[PDB]
Symmetry: C4
Subunit: 304 residues, 4 copies
């Protein structure tokens, strides 16, 4: 005998089905473990040409990221984006403060990476110029809705006035929006609006974006390691966290400890999560769910 | 490449599908922004021949509307209906108290608009006569269920004994009910009963009513700007608010401030909401959802 | 034009559809009002040969029914069943205490009706004999699950040793169970177990039972007038209430007032509910939902 | 007439349907009672060659099972597994402490049964050797995810170095995982991970495992007698309880009383539950749901 029929759903049937799901609406069926967790490689792609030893990224929120944070984040394997809710002069001053840890994220010159947010209005161009000076590695046009002529133009701009600077498009949740931002020439995409339901939004935008070599950043909703694993598993290349970090020490302010103990923790969990599903890298988990090897299963409200 | 398949649901498939939805059961997928929010025109139709610079309307509730309120409402772009839970003499006295702000809603003689509720019994005819005198612009046969012979007759009555006065039909939730009220000759419709689930009720009654040129007032359930935008987007021409206003200053009684700061706020949000979905007027948003350009997506309970 | 397509669901499609619904899982679409509420006739059938001027019935619970209650209930239009959680001698003593109000429920000799619960074991036969003496009108074999050989036999028994006494079968939720109890010869049925979901249970058991002329008592879950109206509308001939009454004065013990003010209230609401849906009697409401004139609509969890 | 159509769902349609259900997502339709509860035989199979007079099994949790508990459990009809969160020397010392009650679970030599958990790493082999000495009856490779090469090998090991010792495989939730553990040669299976949703997990793994004569232990989620009955009814041969017992007296620590009063209680309820559905043994309940005689019905979130 020994034939075993066939597990649950395939990412496709589940996230193209008038569903509209969250991270908590489904679980993932385990696989075959035949190696240890510490062998799981979490290397991820932040933008077409920026790569991290971990998929973690902090949010451009005054209550979250600022030099202090941006630094730890990079030392430990991630990267941070400074909030533009301050004087342009104050922001670029943060960017420069930032500019053993085998994982440390560094530029082509041994320096910790740093990114920062900027609006899509005129006055922002100046801010940009200060930021570019302080040696910023990447910029993220920070908007709740990004499929606008005001972002498309700010993109075509920066893409020209600064060819070696990587640009990340404003928040989108459909492939109809992503198209435009990818034509204007963005180097990555920030997915999230309402935290459309997140999981379904990530699934959809990644599925289109990969066809062009554009990474996707799962932005919003991450509450625990689980959500992170589910967000990567659906297509996201990296994950952005806001509130889940606002209680660390490196956070600007008056729970948890330093980013130097928390981040390691997260990385541990995530590899452990990649073991349970029998994948050795994150790249492999994405390949599995697109092929149909990785199976899922919905949970009822009362089943949560 | 660059083809992008096709977004979520179309208002139709979603609100004719044994669903029975609320404002919180679904979200709307964003569109293409290529203009500023302050360019969004919120002009709406209260009744076949009454038109406002904003879709806002206050409720005929003693805890909400009375002269003071009715006035602000009109100065700012809306309109109010005085509650008939008082002596006929007291009600019409409110109507007369009422009878820069470029938006100010005015009659053909520079006077702020005013409306008021009245029952469908005999004794109400008198009340009417006092109200008509004080110069009331519109009357709304105020009932929990309006598809009755007692309203059909009160309609045919008022429609005759007062040809220049606009009549709004009592609360309905189906197109089977709306038919009768539209034949008796109402000039508009008040949709809501149980706050059937509201969103599905608005969708349905508007879809039928538009075929006759009869506006629909989304009555009940509005808790925040979002619900307002969703209610208009489904077909409603205007929106009536009760409790969301009962905490303003212009409200009769012993949170929030004056209607002169709140209303502006609401108008701001609503245009902003119309931007996110790429529509320039409310008229355009309705045209988009009826055509199938505007897309939606359901959220699970646990996805809320 | 004026054609109006077609309202929601038909009781059938909705309660034979792997649903498993509660009273709160759905609402009923309004109809055409063309008469006043006080014209609604609430006459209902308790058992094949017992008939009440209202569908109300109190529960055989020590915390609810006992002589005092049983009396009010009948004076006002209902009927009560005394709890058998006491000495047989004490129970029959209650039955005898019981043995203007135009609605008053009376026997063929001007006496208030009274019913009472009894087990299905040997010792219960004696209890019965005392009860029959005190002039009890009806008996209800009181069990959580009634499709047993121990009830079938207690039925065939009582049906013989007392031909003029009406017997009500123990709690069932399927038509598979009802069959047996109806063959043993019961004169009515008590539906409810888990308060299977109630609404679906009532629907199902009534649909089968009517084919034999056996009334059904919706037992359990009634929290407000609404549930009562929905329970009758689904097929139930009468409704049994436990906790909703335990806070009246006529209740045995140390909220609400007397049954003489509460019951009237309930009757008022129920007629009002029968108006909203355009039915003049309860008999008519049942006829409407079986024909397909009466329409329903499900509500999502988040739509409740 | 008297034909009665056909009850609800069949375990199959319901637990192979992209559902993902919990114990609370459904109920079971009653059957035909024609015998007393105390006639219900709860004999169950713990492992291919271990059999208990009741399906109860305590959890390998320091907050739950340890000698004291393990003993009561066996005296009353169940069995316990000592937690390996202690020195190997301390664990085997518990096993030996353990090594009228007609139900008492005993070895071939009049001694109370005892089982215990052990990891799947090298160092665990030693622990094993101490445990085997103290006369342990069964071992349960204790892991959150069991489909690993590290468990498959620890199985093939123990199966050889100790032929008369019964081995239970680490936690699984699919038949894809169960296959491997059954080939390595386990004598039973522990189902549960996330407490995939439990009910659906039990259903699935039992359905495959029975084809090989391998019992399944429903592990996790049991909160009351009901869940226990539903877990057995779906295919499980026995049920493991953690927290529901942590408040007994026999539990290690500083609610409820002794296991000698609680367990009886549970057994009583469970037979009563087997009566309501007309089954005389647990073996019969499983046979009924696999044949399609036993019917179920889903409940909406708002129907819970
Ligand atoms: N990530 C998210 O989804 C999210 C949610 Se709230 C949030 C944060 O909240 C902020 C506010 O959201 P907004 O939609 O206001 O975003 P943004 O700050 O981009 O402002 C959008 C408004 O700015 C206008 N605008 C931009 N450039 C313009 C120009 N050159 N000329 C004329 N009008 C122009 C837009 O048309 C629009 O109404 C965002 O900047 C971001 O920092 N992000
Ligand atoms: N908008 C809503 O959905 C809603 C919910 Se409660 C609510 C407010 O609550 C009030 C009460 O709801 P009701 O259903 O009682 O509404 P209404 O005040 O219209 O009264 C309805 C009752 O009045 C009777 N009636 C009306 N005219 C009659 C006449 N000429 N002869 C004989 N009977 C007549 C109806 O037949 C019915 O039973 C409403 O008037 C309204 O102010 N509105
Ligand atoms: N209405 C309801 O659904 C409901 C829920 Se609880 C509830 C009340 O709780 C009480 C307990 O529920 P039960 O299932 O125990 O109901 P009941 O009091 O009918 O007792 C049932 C038990 O009594 C046994 N029994 C009855 N007659 C017997 C006889 N002559 N010989 C041998 N065994 C016999 C049954 O086989 C069964 O295990 C009910 O009597 C009722 O008063 N009613
Ligand atoms: N029953 C359950 O579902 C459940 C949930 Se939490 C839980 C308890 O929590 C504990 C922890 O869960 P874990 O997944 O850590 O389970 P376990 O204690 O089996 O440890 C698993 C980790 O140990 C590693 N491992 C095992 N043998 C190894 C070997 N010989 N060489 C190299 N690596 C090896 C695995 O590859 C894996 O990453 C379990 O042991 C159990 O006691 N059980
Ligand atoms: O990770 P959490 O805290 O859920 O949310 C992170 C995302 O929240 C969004 N956000 C931040 N402040 C906001 C104010 N209002 C609404 N959304 C906001 C951003 O897109 C940010 O990256
Ligand atoms: O806007 P909210 O406060 O949800 O509700 C407004 C609507 O509530 C209804 N309403 C007012 N008082 C009521 C008393 N009982 C039930 N419904 C009421 C009216 O139709 C009113 O316009
Ligand atoms: O009307 P409520 O209070 O919901 O419940 C009434 C029904 O509850 C049931 N009931 C009473 N006591 C019970 C104890 N345990 C479980 N069910 C009970 C009976 O069937 C009774 O007629
Ligand atoms: O019976 P309850 O208390 O729900 O859970 C019992 C099961 O819980 C699991 N478990 C115990 N401690 C755990 C720590 N973390 C997660 N799962 C655990 C085990 O599989 C155990 O047999």
């Amino acid at each position: 005998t020994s034939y075993v029929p066939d597990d649950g759903l395939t990412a496709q049937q589940l996230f193209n089905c008038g569903d509209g799901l969250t991270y908590n609406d489904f679980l993932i069926l385990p696989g075959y473990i035949d190696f240890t967790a510490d062998q799981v490689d979490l290397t991820s792609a932040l933008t077409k040409k920026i790569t991290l030893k971990t998929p973690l990224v902090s949010s451009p929120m005054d209550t979250v990221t600022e030099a202090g944070m941006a630094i730890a984040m990079a030392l430990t394997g991630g990267i941070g984006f400074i909030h533009h809710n301050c004087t342009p002069e104050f922001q670029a001053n943060e960017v420069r403060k930032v500019k053993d840890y085998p994982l440390a994220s560094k530029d082509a010159k041994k320096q910790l990476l740093c990114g920062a947010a900027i609006g899509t209005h005129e006055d922002d161009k100046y801010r940009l110029d200060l930021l570019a000076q302080a040696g910023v590695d990447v910029v993220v046009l920070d908007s709740s809705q990004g499929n606008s002529i005001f972002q498309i133009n700010m993109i075509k701009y920066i893409k020209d006035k600064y060819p070696n600077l990587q640009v990340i498009g404003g928040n989108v949740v459909t492939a109809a929006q992503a198209k435009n931002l990818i034509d204007a020439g963005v180097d990555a995409l920030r997915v999230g609006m309402g935290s459309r339901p997140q999981a379904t939004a990530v699934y959809k935008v990644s599925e289109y974006a990969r066809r062009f070599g554009v990474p996707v950043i799962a932005d919003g909703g991450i509450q625990n390691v689980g959500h992170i694993a589910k967000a990567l598993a659906l297509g996201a290349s990296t994950v952005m966290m806001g509130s889940l970090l606002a209680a660390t020490t490196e956070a600007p302010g008056e729970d948890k400890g330093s980013i130097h103990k928390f981040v390691p923790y997260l990385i541990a969990g995530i590899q452990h999560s990649c073991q349970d599903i029998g994948a050795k890298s994150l790249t492999q988990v994405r390949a599995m769910m697109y092929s149909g090897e990785l199976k899922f299963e919905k949970r009822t409200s009362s089943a949560q």
